[PDB]
Design a protein around this ligand. Sequence first.
Ligand SMILES: O=C(Cn1ccc2c(=O)[nH]c(N3CCC(Cc4ccccc4)CC3)nc21)Nc1ccncc1Cl
Ligand SMILES: O=C(Cn1ccc2c(=O)[nH]c(N3CCC(Cc4ccccc4)CC3)nc21)Nc1ccncc1Cl
Lengths: 122, 122
Amino acid sequence: SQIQFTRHASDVLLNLNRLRSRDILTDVVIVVSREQFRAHKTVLMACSGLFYSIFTDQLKRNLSVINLDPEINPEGFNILLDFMYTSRLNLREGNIMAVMATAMYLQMEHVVDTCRKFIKAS
Amino acid sequence: SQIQFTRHASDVLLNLNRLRSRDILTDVVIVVSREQFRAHKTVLMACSGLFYSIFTDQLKRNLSVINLDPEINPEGFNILLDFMYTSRLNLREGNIMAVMATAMYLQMEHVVDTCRKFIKAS
Ligand SMILES: O=C(Cn1ccc2c(=O)[nH]c(N3CCC(Cc4ccccc4)CC3)nc21)Nc1ccncc1Cl
Ligand SMILES: O=C(Cn1ccc2c(=O)[nH]c(N3CCC(Cc4ccccc4)CC3)nc21)Nc1ccncc1Cl
């Protein structure tokens, strides 16, 4: 009973990543050792179980700075952060493990599973 | 060189609409005559030329209340607001005009064009 716009969701995600590229309405900085990454809490909740659980919590929802455990690999987080904003996963042999272990910490179950299927295909 | 996750963008949009259904991280109320609608500015910028232009403007970006012209049809705005959050357009013969004229006011060019193709198919 309703017309489906099959590329609207990808169009929207492209525009959210535009806004993040320009720092418009970003509302948190993620400290990953020496790196910082600004983002929209909503987009992070929408992609990670770690961030969903942190920010649904009234006690932590209005945080503007999140410090990840300094054991997180910054490249792995950047590749996953970009995945969140583009729906594209840069998996190389060269960083599969770092990405997997970072996607587990971030409670990104489907991405972790894709990494398991990635291993097999090696 | 990158694995494409073909439903990630739709999954994300579903979660943003969950958050809107629960009022998590909503940051504006849209007054349309007697109706109010809470939403995420980012999602509205990502879908409407009116809201993009209002909120990219540093002078208006931190508005928490937008009052639309009381000539806007509230049903038409609700159908378009829901489209923004689901990628589904409820076009009926019964409200095509109201939706079209509301999508023009909101600078939603593709939706307006779909309404023109909708007319033809009548
Ligand atoms: O789904 C995401 C974000 N995302 C994406 C993948 C993924 C993942 O693999 N795991 C989780 N978890 C957090 C909540 C989970 C189940 C749950 C659902 C509802 C209430 C309690 C628990 C378990 C772990 N989140 C994930 N966000 C989201 C979820 C629900 N409603 C709105 C949004 Cl925005
Ligand atoms: O595209 C949307 C939101 N959206 C969705 C459809 C649609 C539409 O049909 N028209 C406009 N207009 C606003 C800006 C337009 C061109 C422009 C682009 C860049 C700079 C100046 C002008 C003309 C009218 N927006 C639209 N948002 C968005 C756009 C760009 N970057 C980030 C985001 Cl979030």
